[PDB]
Amino acid sequence: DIQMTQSPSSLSASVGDRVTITCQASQDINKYLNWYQQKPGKAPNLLISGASNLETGVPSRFSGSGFGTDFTFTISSLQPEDIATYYCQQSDNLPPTFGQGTKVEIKRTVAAPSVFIFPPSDEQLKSGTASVVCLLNNFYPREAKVQWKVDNALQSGNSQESVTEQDSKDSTYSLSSTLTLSKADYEKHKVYACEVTHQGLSSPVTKSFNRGEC
Amino acid sequence: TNLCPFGEVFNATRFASVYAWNRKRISNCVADYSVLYNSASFSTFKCYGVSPTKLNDLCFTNVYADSFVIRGDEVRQIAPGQTGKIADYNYKLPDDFTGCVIAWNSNNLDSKVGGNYNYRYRLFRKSNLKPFERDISTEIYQAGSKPCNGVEGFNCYFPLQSYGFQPTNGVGYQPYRVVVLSFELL
Amino acid sequence: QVQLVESGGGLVQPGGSLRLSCAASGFTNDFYSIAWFRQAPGKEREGVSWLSVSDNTPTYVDSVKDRFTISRHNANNTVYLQMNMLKPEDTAIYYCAAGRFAGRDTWPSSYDYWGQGTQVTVSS
Amino acid sequence: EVQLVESGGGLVEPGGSLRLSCAASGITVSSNYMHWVRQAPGRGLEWVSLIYSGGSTFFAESVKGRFTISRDNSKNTMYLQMNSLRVEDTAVYYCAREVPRISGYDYWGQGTLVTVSSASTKGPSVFPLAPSSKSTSGGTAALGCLVKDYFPEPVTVSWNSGALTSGVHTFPAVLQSSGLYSLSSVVTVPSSSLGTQTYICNVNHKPSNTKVDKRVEPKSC
Ligand SMILES: *[C@@H]1O[C@H](CO)[C@@H](O)[C@H](O)[C@H]1NC(C)=O
């Protein structure tokens, strides 16, 4: 097989910047390297074929070059709709193989998150489980820290986070942290709090409630 | 008795494109097939159903020398039981082939700076070739549901493509001259 | 089943000798071919000597022409490669390969049966 | 219109078998170089197989001997028959058409999800994420639905049967320590509408035929 080495595995550039992505083949592949764009949950789109062919309908800001073993993919001016993962693929040597991909995010100004907290619903408590949700809405950069505290005891190993893909319009993220305890465990404690640390926050923000209170 | 005109085949100045592979039909002549095998010029010399040295001790009528140009990484397809664009759509050996496959690097002859595009191969075909079938048609290949009407376009491709032989190509993309000797065994 | 048992490598001085061997087993008939490839550090697999069994005909590359000798003993179904006048260029991992044909080929994709090679080093 | 559409992916136990379809329009499956390409969750693309118009097939080493390809020319469809499935076969499977040498893999279908696992199907529970003052900021309020404890993927969530799309974040599911997925879908609306507008999330988990409409009202205490 032919290994494709794609660099960098991820990059962050502002709108209008030039983006360069390299792909290097372990053996000679002549000109037979293709480039694809994949948005999350979507099928890949062919952008470049045969190392430099600008494929049908693809905007002219995309280009490729190279021959033999060293190949290059360029976005001459990064656009908000370009947030995606890009893959090279050598096509003419069996088995056809792919680069590891390059996740392209967009740099924008710092934006603090709005933090909201949701107690468990009465419906869930009748099932014997309590989920507390903490919501971080429309922030940048992606790095954020959510600490659950339960009567000021720090909680580890009973929560899970999920982040949305960067928004194609305002280039922000959103995050949910869900803390899950049994009903009996949830009734032992009073103050449920998530403490959010983020670059846009001068000091960490805490949102909390007391169990059984308006 | 008389020696086979193998020089006209191996040492021919120009070679056919693989889709229009050339065939030379030679009567039951004599030839030192042992000297052919021991020629350093030949980098590929693979025989099936018979040993290179025991070729003269065969009972046959006509010998055929088919010959053409393919790229180096395609030489593996000139053999019984192979699949791929060449074996499927250009030149197919039968499963019970009796004969020899001879090949050698011709980069110094068939490559040109800026690319030599004279050599072609069939890239699109609806079905596989039968053994020793030759197809030289040039009908537009209909890859979709709309008829092409002899006009190339989307889903409407000319069925032959040029090799791009450049001196600086890697060896898998350099041109190789191939001669296949088969024997009409009695 | 087809299996190539390989041995005979080692360290030697420039100018010395070394005798490699390839013991084939699993061939119904003598209609197969043996080849010797070597893989230098960073370089590709490259044939140096060949032997079609059914007609017992050897072939060599120009670099090892008068220095190597390939032959076969029919009793033990073993192919030998006598390497005389060894040079530092001959330092490589030597493999023997077999294909279901009578002849030779420089392309590794024509041989389906290989042995995990023995190391050969030539230095002083 | 030119399209490839995959179907047939679902939950299957290890060592089971399953058949995917790739139904084309515009492209004639049997006249093209047709590929299967798969993508494990959160991973890169991996080629699986290829069939020539003339019938020659090629397969990746990981699936060699377990996968085969069939074609039904009268339905303009390609099939991938998968036998002796392993956990690491879990992926989204795409079919794609290649125009080799002169182009690339120019059409792909949307993909079909294959989950190879011993876990059994379970439908989700849907719980309100009620809006409140603690959910209100800058004239907006956040409300949502907690789609908890389901297997396998995926679920779909809409709000007010598609009439509410602005401001909806449906977070990607995460696999909990129980082996069940969980997800929240939240929407930010103007606080002015909390007492007067009706908000309902529409959760659909096709692997278990579970459709749930959940009305989300502010919590009264
Ligand atoms: C081709 O020409 C060379 C040089 O004249 C000659 O040595 C060789 O024998 C010829 N090959 C054949 C098959 O006649």
Residue numbers in the entry:
A (entry chain L): 1 to 214
B (entry chain E): 333 to 518
C (entry chain A): 1 to 124
D (entry chain H): 1 to 221
Quoted from the paper:
BA.2.86, a recently described sublineage of SARS-CoV-2 Omicron, contains many mutations in the spike gene. The characteristic spikes on the surface of coronaviruses are formed by trimers of S, linked to the virion through transmembrane helices at the C terminus. S is made up of an N-terminal S1 domain, responsible for attachment to the host receptor angiotensin converting enzyme 2 (ACE2),2 and a C-terminal S2 domain, which through conformational rearrangement executes fusion of host and viral membranes, allowing entry of viral RNA into the host cell cytoplasm, initiating the infectious cycle. The RBD is positioned at the top of S and can adopt a range of conformational states, from a fully exposed “up” conformation, able to interact with ACE2, to a more hidden “down” conformation.
The complex of XBB-2 Fab with Delta RBD and nanobody C1 was determined at 2.3 Å resolution by crystallography. While for many of the antibodies belonging to this public gene family neutralization was knocked out by variation in the RBD,27,29,37 XBB-2 has structural differences, notably in the light chain variable regions that allow it to effectively neutralize XBB. Despite contacting residues 455 and 456 in the RBD, this antibody can still neutralize viruses mutated at these residues, although at much reduced potency. It is notable that 5/10 of the potent XBB mAbs belong to the public IGHV3-53/66 gene family and are likely to bind in a similar position to XBB-2.
